[PDB]
Amino acid sequence: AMKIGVIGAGTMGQGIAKAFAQVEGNTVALCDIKQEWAENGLAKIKKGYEKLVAKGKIPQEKADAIVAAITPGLKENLCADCDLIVEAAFEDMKVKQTTFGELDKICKPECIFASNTASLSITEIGKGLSRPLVGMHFFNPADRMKLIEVIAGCNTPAETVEKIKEISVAIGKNPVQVNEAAGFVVNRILIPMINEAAFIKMEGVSDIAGIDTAMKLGANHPMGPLELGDFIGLDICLAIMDVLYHETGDSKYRACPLIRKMVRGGNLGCKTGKGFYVYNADRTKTPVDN
Amino acid sequence: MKIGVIGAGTMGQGIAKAFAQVEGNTVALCDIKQEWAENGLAKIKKGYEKLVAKGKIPQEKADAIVAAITPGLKENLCADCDLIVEAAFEDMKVKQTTFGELDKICKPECIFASNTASLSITEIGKGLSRPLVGMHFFNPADRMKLIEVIAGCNTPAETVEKIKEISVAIGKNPVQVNEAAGFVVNRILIPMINEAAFIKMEGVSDIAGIDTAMKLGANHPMGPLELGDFIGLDICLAIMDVLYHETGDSKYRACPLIRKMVRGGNLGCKTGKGFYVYNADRTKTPVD
Amino acid sequence: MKIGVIGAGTMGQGIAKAFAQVEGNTVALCDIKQEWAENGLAKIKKGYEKLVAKGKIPQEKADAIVAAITPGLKENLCADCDLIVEAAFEDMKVKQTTFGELDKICKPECIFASNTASLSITEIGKGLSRPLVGMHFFNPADRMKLIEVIAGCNTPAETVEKIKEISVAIGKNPVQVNEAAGFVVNRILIPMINEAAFIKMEGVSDIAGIDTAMKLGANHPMGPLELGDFIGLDICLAIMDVLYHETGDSKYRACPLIRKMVRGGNLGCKTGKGFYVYNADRTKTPVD
Amino acid sequence: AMKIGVIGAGTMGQGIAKAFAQVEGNTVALCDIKQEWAENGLAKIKKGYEKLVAKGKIPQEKADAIVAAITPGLKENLCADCDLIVEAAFEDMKVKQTTFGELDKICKPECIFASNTASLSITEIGKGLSRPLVGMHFFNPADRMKLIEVIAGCNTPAETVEKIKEISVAIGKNPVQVNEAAGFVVNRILIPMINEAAFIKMEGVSDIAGIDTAMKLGANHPMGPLELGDFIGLDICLAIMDVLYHETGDSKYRACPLIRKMVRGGNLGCKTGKGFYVYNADRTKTPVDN
Amino acid sequence: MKIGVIGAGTMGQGIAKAFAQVEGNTVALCDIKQEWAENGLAKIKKGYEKLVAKGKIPQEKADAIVAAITPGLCADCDLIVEAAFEDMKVKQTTFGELDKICKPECIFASNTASLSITEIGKGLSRPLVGMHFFNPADRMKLIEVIAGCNTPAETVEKIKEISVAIGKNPVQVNEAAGFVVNRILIPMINEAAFIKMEGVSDIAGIDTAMKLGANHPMGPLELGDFIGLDICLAIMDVLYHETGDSKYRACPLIRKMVRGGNLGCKTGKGFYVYNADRTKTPVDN
Amino acid sequence: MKIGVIGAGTMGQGIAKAFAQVEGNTVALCDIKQEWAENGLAKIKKGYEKLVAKGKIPQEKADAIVAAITPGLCADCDLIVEAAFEDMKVKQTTFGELDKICKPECIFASNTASLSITEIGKGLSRPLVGMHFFNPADRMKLIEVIAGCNTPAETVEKIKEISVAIGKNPVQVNEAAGFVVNRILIPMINEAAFIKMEGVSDIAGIDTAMKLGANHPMGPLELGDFIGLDICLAIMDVLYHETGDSKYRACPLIRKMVRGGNLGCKTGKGFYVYNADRTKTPVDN
Ligand SMILES: CC(=O)CC(=O)SCCNC(=O)CCNC(=O)[C@H](O)C(C)(C)COP(=O)(O)OP(=O)(O)OC[C@H]1O[C@@H](n2cnc3c(N)ncnc32)[C@H](O)[C@@H]1OP(=O)(O)O
Ligand SMILES: CC(=O)CC(=O)SCCNC(=O)CCNC(=O)[C@H](O)C(C)(C)COP(=O)(O)OP(=O)(O)OC[C@H]1O[C@@H](n2cnc3c(N)ncnc32)[C@H](O)[C@@H]1OP(=O)(O)O
């Protein structure tokens, strides 16, 4: 028995709504700024579940049972008696502080405020609030990845970290406590990997398929690092590298100028059909250095 | 085809099985003492008897593998070798005079390759009469499918192709690398371990947590702290210091935490304590 | 001598007492609102009444000090000023147009000085008709004996000497500085605080311990963590980021720990919590 | 009631011997490699105490009472039933590992092994030993400075840190626990100060007396940073900077090339009569830039 | 061919000279304030007068090229070269304001020093290319030809031919910060400034060192004053911000001098004070 | 004056030429293997022959200077210039072995590229000074005069006069890593190598870029091959180790080529392969 409000209806918010609604006994309020943005979010969840039922990987009764626990709307209307708030709205500081300042008046006092952000300070987002702000960081696709990073901020009490811990296990996830530093644990290790694999390309050491092949056969990684960057989106890798550099001031985390030149040109990876690989119609991918 | 493997230690052992696994090849497993090489082949043959009893290899395929390997001294066994893969102690002067000696023994068409991970292929073969290429296996060499082929600054393109063709002819996937510090795998993978240690050092997360986050967040088979324990923190410290010294770039500065643990003998699995304590059962316990 | 002090805040207050303390000087304490400047002088006069009751100043020396200071607007009080010390909000465009306005008011021989710590003296006075020098007091300006005199890239040697002579004429010790980021004191002293924080961040010692070690090991009056609390961690973060941005050098990267505490409002004494909790008695407690 | 053996009879060892022998109830074995090196150490302690009695700052009975508790000799002869060993021998790794490997056989099992080193790893010094090695770091003059840094190594148990804690209070010092990192607490903060004050000189920002005057009047420090470097010895500042750089790999701790050029020329500060200041006969010091 | 130059400063003026001195080309010269865009064409006749006087040019040739330059015109050019201020939104906006104004099929080229070509041309209808001239653009034989990720080869090659058509040498260079010449030459100026700042030598010694020790036509500090110390700071900063590498941090002595307006030859005081005698004096005497 | 040069390589040979070509000086040329120290004087007559053939020198002048050079002699010189290998203990030992051999009052000078002068002369009886020539020492007009902390002015000035006496220009420079010219010029070669390594351009383009874009007599990569890529690596490494600043990290492509013995003109293959035709080919074609 839990009510969960999810502020943001793009990719992350829809997956976070699905992660709670998969557990029987949870109802999800899928909110956004315009009521029609939330409705497009719930239709996107529905459309996506129609594909799996087709590909035979989920039963239609389950899909229906998931969709039935999600309600689109506005936070003023749906988040009063919410037990947990998980925001996955746009990565802008002032938008977050506004959202949470409103919800602070809307929500009952018992409500837990959490943010899925990966680029901003949990500490600075929840500064003015009347209650603890915590980080509850999901990984795309949030309904299938079992990791949750629980980020403590400078003032986030330990009970608040402990509660998000219990909730993550309740929904079948594995929490990992992180004290707020840029990149947390997973992003701080993983994106500098992608960045090194790009320096190795830029410096002429090896080719794209070779760097990826070496990482797949040499370390038993599921993808190559450059494959992976296309699939994450090179724009997001660049932004994480730049966040890792600006927070620390450490030249160690400088982004590879090759990534920046591709993002400038719009070659963001799988989402643009072209990054280090070209994604064609016939389901084949070829590295851009051929 | 006849291959000479210089070094009867673990790597040399694994490289000899890789070539002897394949029908039609012969391997001379050499080391600096006739006995060393004969102990190398005895470790190989008993690893094969555990496999036979485990039922995962025919008793006659294993015998035919052991039969294809001959221990001895290079002065006796490598003159009509077609390919030499060196896998001996990582010291630049020991590798240079081993390849100086082999330059006089081995027939001209014999190809010279070194399994080195941390020394410069180019420097290795500076003064020789024939090209020197990198042929960097991954342990266990008989089981890992990747082979990094390292072109030196004067290693002709023809030499690099023929080592590619040999790697596939023994069932590997060659990835051509133009020599730089760390090649591909080590240059990505060891700074990874190093970063997880800085995360531990700086109080961001705990050892178990850093490792759980990378396997459940990034789909990695091992956490980076378990893996640096499995590779050996001494191997990880040394690769970091190579990257640092070959580049000049503070980016590759090793994490002082790893340097403190290596100074105390806490190297990982090989000493029974690193980031994890490895107990008498099978569990491992984070020192956290 | 007649001095104009631009800014009736704490620094401007402390700089006006420094000049009015000395017999024969007059000070115009100006700010952008007539009331602000009159509140500045009222804070000054009541600080002097606590001193009189504490018996540490004659009742007539204090009255004569307060009498030498006149609040108002610069357009009214600074035209026949001999020296202008600006001490207003640290924003480059606010300082440039304040000195543009004063360039038309003040008689030509009036000397223009700014108390800025983080902005470029040279940029401050780029387009003016007269030189612009740094005259950087230390709070409390009336009590600290040091004055850093900052030569700009176009500040003549004659201007620098005359500010030296004024500093001693009001009983200070001038230390000539050729403009660079941090001058002398801030460039040594704030990286100090920053380093003690990295030591805390990296788990080397504890907050009380870092502070006790520096006072009993180096003969320092305050620990560096107490001192960053007393200066304000926001002031310390900002100086770090100036040093970093003016140099380009990772050496002066601020410690992320200090950046996290500033984002949470834990700035030190001014907010009642930083590295120390400051309780209702007089004790302070390390957040450690 | 405590017996203390001090391995090293130069400056540090003599001051460490004096710090324990000042406390009634402690007897000090002042050891070195050649019996005559320890005797010169005890005569140096005696000569130095004859000066204070002259300058009127200590009573002669006290000096005599201190000297009487110090015995020069060889560790084989004097350190068997020692309660604590504090080595302040030369800063060389192999010398330390040899000294401690011998003392490990000499000393009773109850004996605490400690090292005053400031440049080497406590962890690497006591690796092969049969008992914990700890760092007990004194500050010249060890008999008058109240700070002791107690350094835990990678394997130094907490009881061993706790015991050196009690002993430091017993002798009137204030211990500070430090987990082993280069420079500990005091040196990592202080010498990079001296180094910055030297960059400021080298870059032409201010003059020698001005940098020192600013630091004395601006921060209320007892000395200027350049004054202080002369008094510490610029060779030692250089070595600490170089140790801080090599251990971290961080360009942040690069030594100022001005310090290195003065050390090369032999201008080590007060001990050579010339560093940033020239130390004349008539008790006056003038900065070398005049 | 018709050619429009955007910017009327040293480089704008020199790029205009470079096109108009080849028989057959016509140039449109432009700037913000028109009085500055005629001040441009004014500095062009003034210099051609001093050379015809010195016998280096025939008056009729000097008069044939200053008649091919029109201060404005851009509606009909076959090629646009912007030599505007080295600020990114400054270049997007101009080029933004410019995709309307020019004929549909006319080539857009920027003379930027180190900025990404690819970001410069993002909202445009047509490919954007890099065509980099070197001070003085009318004498220096080099053109660096920089193509962005979305720059076709027909345009890269159409620039190579135009280059050889006006007596230049076009070297093609891939898009990275500083391209070739500035990435090498500007840190060299920056280093010489650190050498003066740390007192290793004086301004005079460093410059004659590199002239007599390296056979360089200018010392690195005279060369900074001639380039403009504000352009040098910019490129250093762009170098530093593109790579993230403290290797390229500008020398604080150059940031101090740009803040004071000691920019070199354009303001009469850089590392040298330039006198009417035509003699320059190092500011450290 | 009598002059002894220590080292018989390019710089040793050129420094010998620089003294002997001035009427009145005599030089003693030296090296490890004597066959190398006559190989030195062999490369000196061979080059003077090719110039007399090309009419640049009169045979009698070529014959007057090769008669002032004696392969050895050092016992009586008034001035010693070492141009030995750029390894510190290599220079201390030589100079160590040399304070005995030379006359008591003779001036000791090192042609080191970046090493501290002050540490070079520590155990010596006499001041040690820096007298830095530039390849080719007989043409390049510059001498950098470097004094150590314990080098008196009489010796610094005695070098300045000797310099002007052999038609050079002596610039005095304070002891820091790289002095002036190499601290600027060598990272410039190093940068051009990073530019080739990151693929921004090819070897040819970078060099003609800097010739046509900067008016440089050699491109930075030809200049590396002419200096020797082993000397360039050394100076970069010394730069990096003296400052501690990753700004000066050598480019790994130059460390790889030195490891392979691709040193430039002295080994026939650097960034260019040098052919008997007298044409050089970039190794990337
Ligand atoms: C920052 C960026 O983005 C790109 C950049 O700009 S980086 C900087 C690139 N530019 C440079 O580095 C400049 C390098 N410096 C040089 O090449 C030389 O300094 C230099 C060519 C400018 C030297 O000046 P110079 O040789 O005296 O001028 P130059 O025109 O070549 O020859 C001088 C002659 O102008 C000659 N001349 C003949 N015709 C001429 C003409 N049409 N126009 C001008 N001059 C002419 C005359 O012969 C005059 O010499 P005399 O008085 O002795 O007769
Ligand atoms: C690393 C360190 O520690 C210090 C260093 O060395 S750093 C590197 C410093 N050195 C440099 O940078 C070199 C810079 N490069 C240059 O200055 C030019 O490359 C260069 C002078 C070498 C160009 O070569 P050049 O101009 O062709 O040779 P140069 O001798 O000056 O003139 C060529 C002429 O030799 C001339 N010549 C006349 N007399 C001569 C003589 N006594 N000796 C030699 N050449 C003579 C001839 O005129 C020949 O030219 P022609 O065939 O056209 O008639």
Residue numbers in the entry:
A (entry chain C), D (entry chain C): 0 to 289
B (entry chain A), C (entry chain A): 1 to 288
E (entry chain B), F (entry chain B): 1 to 72, 77 to 289
Passage from the reporting paper:
The A2HBD has elevated expression in F. prausnitzii A2-165 and is crucial for the transformation of acetoacetyl-CoA to 3-hydroxybutyryl-CoA in the butyrate cycle. The monomeric structure of A2HBD consists of two domains, N-terminal and C-terminal, with cofactor binding occurring at the N-terminal domain, while the C-terminal domain facilitates dimerization. The A2HBD protein exists as a hexamer in solution.
Additionally, X-ray data of A2HBD in complex with acetoacetyl-CoA at a resolution of 1.9 Å were collected at PAL-XFEL (fourth generation) utilizing Serial Femtosecond Crystallography (SFX). Due to the limited resolution of the electron density map in the adenine moiety of acetoacetyl-CoA obtained from the tertiary structure analysis, a detailed examination of the binding mode between the adenine moiety of the substrate and the enzyme was conducted using fourth-generation PAL-XFEL diffraction data. The structures formed almost the same conformation with the RMSD of 0.19Å. Arg143 (NH1) forms a hydrogen bond with O30 of the substrate within a 3.00 Å distance. The guanidinium moiety is oriented towards the aromatic ring of the adenine moiety in a stacked (parallel) configuration, with a proximate distance (below 4 Å) between the guanidinium and adenine planes. This arrangement suggests the formation of a cation-π interaction that contributes to the substrate′s stabilization. Notably, residue R143 plays a critical role in capturing the adenine phosphate ring, underlining its significance in substrate recognition and catalytic activity.
